[PDB]
Design a protein around this nucleic acid. Structure first.
Ligand SMILES: Cc1cn([C@H]2C[C@H](N=[N+]=[N-])[C@@H](COP(=O)(O)OP(=O)(O)OP(=O)(O)O)O2)c(=O)[nH]c1=O
Ligand SMILES: [Mg+2]
Lengths: 412, 555
DNA sequence: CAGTCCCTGTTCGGGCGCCT
DNA sequence: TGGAAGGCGCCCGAACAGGGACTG
């Protein structure tokens, strides 16, 4: 018995119709059970083919969890509620969160089940549960309350949230709190014990308002960049200087100061690649001033909240992965490398998955948005396995690229 | 007043749009007999109704003989109503495979009598169904009827039928957790570990349950009699098979002929190992008329011959034993053709299948292997809900070299080497470092957008040089060409410097097969070398030899 | 620079198979 | 006769999309 906030799709737009993908038997069982108990609690209810709309559903285990979580892929719905959760009820972003020495992420998503949902909307939360070997047709449902992983949910429940939070915001005046979808990001400059404790207090404090919390610890001040670096050699072959000029030439669309003329000079003849070329005065100097420019910031890169984030990843081999988040080409808001993630030296798809989650997470902390990924993988390869490795409650947008490495720009 | 059997499902038209007005077919009186016959019998039961002209909608009508029967089936073409009817979400997500079925001690297969007709239509919707029944002469008008139930031929019938049916069977299934009911349309497969007696009790019980909802279950039902005919298969207590496949005999083949043939063989490939459709499909490319006649190549003739030999001997599949592992083994068939068998106990197949798809202009065996493993994983996950353990004709180091080196994320799930040839390999490997003592070729080529004339050539550290004139070419082609030349004219170890991104990217992915003949020749040469190092420099940077050969090839 | 062309990849719609 | 549907699969080609280089 609460007042349902009305919701409309973006102007001139229709609800999501997206095929359910095949599910493993364990994910089908976990879902059949989750949905059964979610029904007898009135949170969802069966429906029929009359309703034209569908969203894909599946299950995951959070990192270290062992308990199954239901996960809906609302990306297509969220794209069509964009008006609502950007323009009307949306949330401001705490530029200090990223500065805090520790940040914990909590799943507050269960809270959303409390509030009911505008009834004219539920037609759009439609999702089908598949059967193994198509024994049965799809068991269709729809949501009677605020769904997890819908972008309208954390917005609509925002007033309730702010109210439940205000006591602890008053009790701990300087601890920063951010809400991004099903997660609450919470951070402090307190030492580890103090911090963990205060989290526990926020937990109880959440409990007497009627919520559970099935915690991820980040450290945004540990987060570093991955600058472009030129090699160091005592002797240079023709090949070495060719590779070097190629690299510097590409680097020049970023740092415009970069000069190739004195280094180009060295290459003047038609020479064998393995032949050693000693470095001239002015090339040693050009190489120096280049090394120095690559130390700087890029001029005039700043974050524009009106624009989408874009993330690129390159597979560097030997466990290493490099990435860059940017809005306009060559103006990079950040660059990074990951190494020895899970699946290093064994499974690429798992490592890419881990990388996509880490990158997304940093973007949420830093700008409060998810990037759109350009993934170095084939569509089928990713769509076959990504769910197996997915530990997170949101799902960023992606597209697939083929971009061979004619130059090694981002990693020596 | 009529009566109400089971809960109805709300319907609508495409908003602000209205119904089906189109004239009836010039139907032959022969059908009209068989038509008005059961037509009239409908109304008695509440299936149809007579309607005042107040209903301004008209839709065509016909019927086709139920296959393998003397009886007739009624079909109403709604295409114009379909176009204007609200969109549904189909609940039928696929087809069940026999190979997915577990072994059941006792098994029944029962069809519902007049299924779509046992399901209440929507009150408010019924009107739109208006159609008219023909006569022996054109004098008698014939009555106009509005369906009270689900017509055969609407676009909403199947989803509603399957949905309601599930809702009905729901309660029975909860009471009997140990019964398996595969529900496909109105076809029910019930199986259990019950004793044939207790089981038949249960079958009867079910028939009663379906009765409460208005669902008849005639003696059309398979009772004691393996094999059961189910979904185009014969089901036996320990084995299954496809119902026999007839392959057309035609002396002269049309396009439609080859289509039937191919699709028949694709149906067959779920069980008969080693079916190949490649060459028969080559015959269908870029052809106009389904009717048009085409001759069989000495290629497609061989294929069809050996495929016929495969079909000759009877084969059968087994069922699924959840306790044991799943195993998928793959064989390379040549020309991008792959076959596989999924089994549990060696030599006893659950099912078979093939991957023939050519994906990409340039590709290799390793990539196509990855592609098939994925096709098969997805298939498995649908049927058994789990991924098979894989047996692959690719050495463990081959795979390791490919995946670690490739710039793209790539993976295969748990798998082991099976030494069945022909083995999948990488046919050449690019050096990671320039080759000492090998001649260095700087290559370029250019071409004129208007002339389509161009040059491809090279210069080397040793003084060697060449330029070749080319006709009806493109910039891309000339860059590839320059590389081809450098390869032809060079020793067994060679350094090649190109400024072509396009060329370099094609070759760096180690293709063994190409749509392009020029790339095939490049491939052929790469395989012959002992060491190739390919390097890239940017154009127009005044680099080294790249500048010199850029000169040579504009001139 | 915008405006082409080349090329290569995806998506879609149409034919056959098979079930109901 | 010639004609309906929904679902899954294959194979094809024709359409659209989008990156990179060269040119007005
Ligand atoms: C074969 C076939 C079936 N259907 C649907 C419609 C039918 N429902 N009804 N009425 C179902 C079932 O068809 P079916 O099971 O083959 O026969 P049915 O009509 O139910 O009566 P029965 O012979 O006495 O058993 O499939 C179809 O729409 N077009 C077809 O060509
Ligand atoms: Mg029937």
């Amino acid at each position: 018995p609460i007042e349902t906030v009305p919701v409309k799709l973006k102007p001139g737009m229709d609800g999501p119709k997206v095929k359910q993908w095949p599910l493993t038997e364990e994910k089908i069982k976990a879902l059949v059970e989750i949905c059964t108990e979610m029904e007898k609690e009135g949170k969802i209810s069966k429906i029929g083919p009359e309703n034209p709309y569908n969203t894909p559903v599946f299950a995951i285990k959070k990192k270290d969890s062992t308990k199954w979580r239901k996960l809906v892929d609302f990306r297509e719905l969220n794209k069509r509620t964009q008006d609502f959760w950007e323009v009307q009820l949306g949330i401001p972003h705490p530029a200090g969160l990223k500065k805090k020495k520790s940040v914990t992420v909590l799943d507050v998503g269960d809270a959303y089940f409390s509030v009911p949902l505008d009834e004219d909307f539920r037609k759009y939360t439609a999702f089908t549960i598949p059967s193994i070997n198509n024994e049965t047709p799809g068991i269709r449902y729809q949501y009677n309350v605020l769904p997890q992983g819908w972008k309208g949910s954390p917005a609509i429940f925002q007033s309730s949230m702010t109210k439940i939070l205000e006591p602890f915001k008053k009790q701990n005046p300087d601890i920063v709190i951010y809400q991004y979808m099903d997660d609450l990001y919470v951070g402090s400059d307190l030492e580890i014990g103090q911090h963990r404790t205060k989290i526990e207090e926020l937990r109880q404090h959440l409990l007497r308002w009627g919520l559970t919390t099935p915690g991820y610890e980040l450290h945004p001040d540990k987060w570093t960049v991955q600058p472009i670096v030129l090699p160091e050699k005592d002797s240079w072959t023709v090949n070495d200087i060719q590779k070097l000029v190629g690299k510097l030439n590409w680097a020049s669309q970023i740092y415009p100061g970069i000069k190739v003329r004195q280094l180009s000079k060295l290459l003047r003849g038609t020479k064998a690649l393995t032949e050693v070329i000693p470095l001239t005065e002015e090339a040693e100097l050009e190489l120096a001033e280049n090394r120095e420019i690559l130390k700087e910031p890029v001029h005039g890169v700043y974050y524009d909240p009106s624009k989408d984030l874009i993330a690129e990843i390159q597979k560097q081999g030997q466990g290493q992965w490099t990435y860059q988040i940017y809005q306009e080409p060559f103006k990079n808001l950040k660059t990074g490398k990951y190494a020895r993630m899970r699946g290093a030296h064994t499974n690429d798809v798992k490592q890419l998955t881990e990388a996509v989650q880490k990158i997304t997470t940093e973007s949420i902390v830093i700008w409060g948005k998810t990037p759109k990924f350009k993934l170095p993988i084939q569509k089928e390869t990713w769509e076959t396995w990504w769910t197996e490795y997915w530990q997170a409650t949101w799902i960023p947008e992606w597209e697939f690229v083929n971009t061979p490495p004619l130059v090694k720009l981002w990693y020596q | 007043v009529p009566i109400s059997p089971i809960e109805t499902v709300p319907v609508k038209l495409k908003p602000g749009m209205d119904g089906p007005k189109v004239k009836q077919w010039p139907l032959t009186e022969e059908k009209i007999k068989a038509l008005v016959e059961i037509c009239t019998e409908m109304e008695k039961e509440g299936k149809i109704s007579k309607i005042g002209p107040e209903n301004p909608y008209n839709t065509p009508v016909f019927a086709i003989k139920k296959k393998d029967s003397t009886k007739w089936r009624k079909l109403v073409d709604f295409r114009e109503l379909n176009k204007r009817t609200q969109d549904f979400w189909e609940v039928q997500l696929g087809i069940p495979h026999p190979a997915g079925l577990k072994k059941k001690k006792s098994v029944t297969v029962l069809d519902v009598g007049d299924a779509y007709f046992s399901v209440p239509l929507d009150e408010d919707f019924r009107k739109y169904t208006a159609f008219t029944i023909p006569s022996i002469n054109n004098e008698t008008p014939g009555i106009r009827y509005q369906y009270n139930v689900l017509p055969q031929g609407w676009k909403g019938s199947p989803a509603i039928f399957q949905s309601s049916m599930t809702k009905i069977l729901e309660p029975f299934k909860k009471q009997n957790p140990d019964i398996v009911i595969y529900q496909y349309m109105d076809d029910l497969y019930v199986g259990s570990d019950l004793e044939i007696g207790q089981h038949r009790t249960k079958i009867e019980e079910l028939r009663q349950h379906l009765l409460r909802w208005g669902l008849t279950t005639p003696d059309k039902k398979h009772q004691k009699e393996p094999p059961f005919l189910w979904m185009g298969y014969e089901l036996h207590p320990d084995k299954w098979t496809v119902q026999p496949i007839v392959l057309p005999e035609k002396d002269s083949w049309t396009v439609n002929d080859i289509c039937k043939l191919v699709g028949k063989l694709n149906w067959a490939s779920q069980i008969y190992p080693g079916i190949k459709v490649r060459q028969l499909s080559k015959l269908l490319r870029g052809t106009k008329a389904l009717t048009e006649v085409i001759p069989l190549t000495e290629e497609a003739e061989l294929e069809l011959a050996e495929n016929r030999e495969i079909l000759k001997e009877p084969v059968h599949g087994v069922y699924y034993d959840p306790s044991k592992d799943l195993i998928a083994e793959i064989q390379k068939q040549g020309q991008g053709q792959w076959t596989y068998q999924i089994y549990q106990e060696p030599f006893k197949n659950l099912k078979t299948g093939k991957y023939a798809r050519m994906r990409g202009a340039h590709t290799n065996d390793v990539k196509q292997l990855t592609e098939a493993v994925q096709k098969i994983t997805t298939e498995s996950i649908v049927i058994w809900g789990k991924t098979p353990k894989f047996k692959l004709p690719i050495q463990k180091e081959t795979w390791e070299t490919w995946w670690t080196e490739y710039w793209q994320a790539t993976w295969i799930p748990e798998w082991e080497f099976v030494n069945t040839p022909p083995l999948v390999k990488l046919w050449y490997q690019l050096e990671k470092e320039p080759i000492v003592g090998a001649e260095t070729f700087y290559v370029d080529g250019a071409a004129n957008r208007e002339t389509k004339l161009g040059k491809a050539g090279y210069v080397t550290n040793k003084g060697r040089q060449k330029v070749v004139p080319l006709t009806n070419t493109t910039n891309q082609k000339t860059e590839l060409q320059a590389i081809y030349l450098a390869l032809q004219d060079s020793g067994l170890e060679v350094n090649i410097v190109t400024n072509s991104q396009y060329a370099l990217g094609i070759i760096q992915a180690q293709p063994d097969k190409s749509e392009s003949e020029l790339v095939n020749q490049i491939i052929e040469q790469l395989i012959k070398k002992e060491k190739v190092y390919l390097a890239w420099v940017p154009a127009h940077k005044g680099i080294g030899g790249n500048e010199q050969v850029d000169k040579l090839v504009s001139a």
